[PDB]
Design a protein around this ligand. Sequence first.
Ligand code: CLA
Ligand code: CLA
Ligand code: CLA
Ligand code: CLA
Ligand SMILES: CC(/C=C/C=C(C)/C=C/[C@@]12O[C@]1(C)C[C@@H](O)CC2(C)C)=C\C=C\C=C(C)\C=C\C=C(C)\C=C\[C@@]12O[C@]1(C)C[C@@H](O)CC2(C)C
Lengths: 210, 213, 230, 215
Amino acid sequence: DAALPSWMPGADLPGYLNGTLPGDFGFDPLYLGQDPVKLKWYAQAELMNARFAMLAVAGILVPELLSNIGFSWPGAGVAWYDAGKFEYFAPASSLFGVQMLLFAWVEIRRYQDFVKPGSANQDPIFTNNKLPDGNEPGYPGGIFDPFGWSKGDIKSLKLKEIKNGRLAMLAFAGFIGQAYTTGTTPLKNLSTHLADPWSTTVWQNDLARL
Amino acid sequence: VRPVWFPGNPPPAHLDGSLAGDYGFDPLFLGQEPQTLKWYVQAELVHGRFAMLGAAGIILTSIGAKVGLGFPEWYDAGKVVVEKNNIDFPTLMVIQFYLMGWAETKRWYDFKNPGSQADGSFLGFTEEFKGLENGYPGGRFFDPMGLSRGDAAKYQEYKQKEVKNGRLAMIACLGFAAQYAATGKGPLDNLADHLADPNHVNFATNGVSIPIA
Amino acid sequence: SRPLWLPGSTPPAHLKGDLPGDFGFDPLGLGANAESLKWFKESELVHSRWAMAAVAGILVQEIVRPDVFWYNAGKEVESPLGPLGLLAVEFFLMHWVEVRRWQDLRKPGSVDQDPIFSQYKLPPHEVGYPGGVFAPFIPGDLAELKVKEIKNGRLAMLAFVGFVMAAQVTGKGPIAALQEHLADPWGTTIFSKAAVVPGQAVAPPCKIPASVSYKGIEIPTPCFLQGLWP
Amino acid sequence: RQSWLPGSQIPAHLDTPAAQALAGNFGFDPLGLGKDPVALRWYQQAELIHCRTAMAGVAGILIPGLLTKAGALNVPEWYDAGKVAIENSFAPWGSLLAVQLFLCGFVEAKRWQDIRKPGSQGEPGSFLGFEASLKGTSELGYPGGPFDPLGLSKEADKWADWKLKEVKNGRLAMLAFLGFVAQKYATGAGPVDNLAAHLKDPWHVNYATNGVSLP
Ligand code: CLA
Ligand code: CLA
Ligand code: CLA
Ligand code: CLA
Ligand SMILES: CC(/C=C/C=C(C)/C=C/[C@@]12O[C@]1(C)C[C@@H](O)CC2(C)C)=C\C=C\C=C(C)\C=C\C=C(C)\C=C\[C@@]12O[C@]1(C)C[C@@H](O)CC2(C)C
């Protein structure tokens, strides 16, 4: 409720979105985050759903971008929905058993940081290595920042992270429906929308399917 | 002093002139309680409100018929639209009870508690369902022209013009059924028969209306 | 003292000649609520400007293209950019423009800045009258033009309805309807084409088809209040 | 506050501070069944346990039902799943229900006495050292301790949320099971099958097109 940037310029504000959180514009019309015990949860819930989406959209497009150019991979050109049935050195059950133990470390390490910040930065077996104090949940730093960034202008970099993140969550939610309706690779849906942009919107592909 | 339904006879004691369309017509003293009369003022409006919608609905679909259009008559519009559009009939009527039984109990707890329904209990809308007086909610949605505020001298005139058109709409929708059960045809077919020969094509010459034919 | 819609009358109490084009004509009491007067003062100007652009749209199209008829010309243009790609652009490019206009109605000091070229800014104008970029080289007095906008505007709103109701009765464009009236005035009126006596109702038929094909699914083309015509 | 009907007078036995301190208090008692305070306290314990058994029950019906219509399971319909899984089994149903009512009856009769006197089972010497953790909390129906492994109880704020989230997912599940029984009598198909039938044709396939909303 100030001269902050807004999603609808001139609209009234909820009042609790003053600007401490990374990249806010007041967009909460369902009034979901009024309770700060829910807003503190939803802020970290936004970052994790964002960062895994930036991994996802770069993990779908780039193996398709460098395959429709045409490289030589053991998995090349295979669709992101068709990567589950694809075989590897092991069946996918055992792979999922490794994930649910390595992430059961990391997520519980990350959740212990959320319930008390400043009390997770110590290794178990290497008791000299630690992340430097003063960090907030969602931004650990230290070895997580190996290139030496975030030593100045952290607010705009958090704003870039949440804006490059929110575009990715829309893009992966793009990837779900736009590969479920037409059933193609969502890099190749761009090919039809660039072949004839006026003869395939979402509407005409809906109406031809309907 | 005011015009009454029957000249000479005074209005009853419970019926001073403040309501719209008040003409002292309560011979059975049915509004003798000042709180059931608060209910019947609600009742005369919503009967007149539906009948004004109804009598316009019979007439406008009968204007289109007999000119040459493909319209049904109002007694046959019920069958022809659950048959043309393949609309299952119980699932049409049940949704009519869901949408209106929603909209009716809001009224039924406006009468019990006029200050209520304005606590943000709905989706956030507070003073739209505040209700101005009995049978006249107003606010943003029910009066989007904003005619119930500004000048209130012309609003009392519109209150009377609603009840006057509302009375004879109820008489019309009592007459459309009566013109159909007696004759057996549409309403503007009965009008055009009365305009063909005004003598002998009235109600007296059916043998259904007077049994002394 | 001001001119009125009916010179012997008096204007109602909610119309005091403040607004442009205020000739005191509101018999149905609609200008009583001052919250809703601003909504109507906006919506008269919007209805006028589209209708001025539409009537000059049909008149220019009729004097350069006697081939096609404007009521049918939404069907036959054969754009290469698709039937729904046009509607998709027009949907998004108007859901931007109108919502900017709507937020100007709600909070007038809220929409003044070019959001992507923030060095540029609209002046703090009057509601419904943006100016600045939308108004260069204004000729003469501004309030004179403000009445000239609505008088030509109200004339054009009645003109477009006159175009549509001529296009459903004689089915030809509004110079072809004018050439029917100028070749034969005594027989080419609506009182000549129709009359209702108490006992029969003679109305003209449509010069409009009930439906059109238009590339697959059919589109219903109804004559606006057929049956209720005189 | 936030009544089930916004115009109603809430009955006075839901507006006392020992009743407005309660989850799911939407002013709904049109029979006046809980006007007596211990009868409210007893029916409050009946609602928590009718709803938690229903939430566990409905998640034992549609979660193996949705994960069967989507593949990767072969669990049959819930109204026929009692007939099967007794042949992939070892006892008769009589020999299985009696051990059930022994195992469930030892639990329920301890919850019975803890309702009658809170902190009943916390007295020393009941169990073999395990009776210490069985005093419940300061309010009954929410035991905690060994019934809270993740430790969500010790907040004192966000706590009325977890109460009211339990009751509302609980009351929805009780209507879901009263659903499941009724949408098995009326049409004989599965509940996900009835959801598939309503999605492919909403405007003709419902309870207006069977013989149970009969005029
Ligand atoms: C992340 C943004 C994004 C982008 C760039 C696209 C792009 C595309 N989608 Mg898609 N989509 C998205 C999100 C997105 N989608 C989401 C979130 C959903 C789920 C609701 C879908 C569901 C979807 C379906 C079901 C279909 C497409 C189709 C298409 C293609 C035709 C264009 C069209 O009809 O627009 C579709 C536009 C929308 C669905 C509206 C989404 C609007 C987004 C969320 C906001 C706009 C983002 C940004 C401001 C503008 C883009 C610029 C930015 C990339 C730099 C096109 C390649 C069609 C296709 O494949 O035909 C070739 C099709 O059938 N999409
Ligand atoms: C639809 C029902 C209905 C209802 C509830 C009311 C209600 C009211 N009218 Mg009203 N009125 C109606 C229809 C109705 N009117 C119609 C159609 C006309 C035109 C004839 C009038 C003409 C009228 C005048 C002129 C006056 C009122 C007045 C009143 C008020 C006091 C009288 C009273 O207690 O009503 C009690 C009403 C009922 C209990 C409902 C009537 C139902 C009866 C019991 C059934 C039988 C009626 C009739 C014999 C059957 C004819 C059809 C039959 C052949 C099938 C009250 C607000 C007076 C007033 O204060 O004005 C505001 C007044 O002066 N009314
Ligand atoms: C709203 C007013 C209205 C109007 C304009 C018409 C018009 C018409 N009706 Mg009709 N009618 C009406 C109401 C109306 N009706 C009502 C309410 C009934 C039920 C009693 C009837 C019953 C009826 C029959 C049975 C027939 C007509 C017919 C006709 C047509 C020929 C005229 C005729 O025979 O007179 C009929 C005139 C009347 C019945 C009286 C007019 C309305 C009076 C004033 C009732 C108003 C109520 C009164 C003021 C208070 C009631 C007192 C009570 C509360 C104690 C004509 C088009 C005939 C037809 O089809 O022509 C071919 C025919 O056969 N009407
Ligand atoms: C004849 C009608 C007419 C008149 C007198 C005005 C007058 C005015 N308008 Mg307005 N306007 C009109 C039509 C008109 N407008 C239409 C149709 C639109 C919609 C496009 C607008 C949109 C509009 C906006 C958005 C704004 C104004 C503003 C103004 C004010 C200052 C600008 C000015 O000097 O305009 C003088 C106008 C003329 C001298 C009319 C010249 C007409 C010539 C002869 C060409 C007409 C024929 C030609 C075929 C039209 C097609 C053009 C194009 C579509 C190809 C003034 C009160 C501004 C304002 O009030 O802000 C302070 C403002 O911001 N108007
Ligand atoms: C417990 C329950 C269901 C539990 C179900 C279970 C465990 C199911 C188990 C199984 O499915 C699985 C898992 C697997 C299957 O293979 C086997 C079985 C065994 C079949 C439902 C409760 C269901 C409880 C219900 C439906 C209660 C509804 C009560 C209502 C609506 C009462 C309202 C009122 O009483 C108030 C509140 C106040 C009064 O004033 C007014 C009125 C209106 C009277």
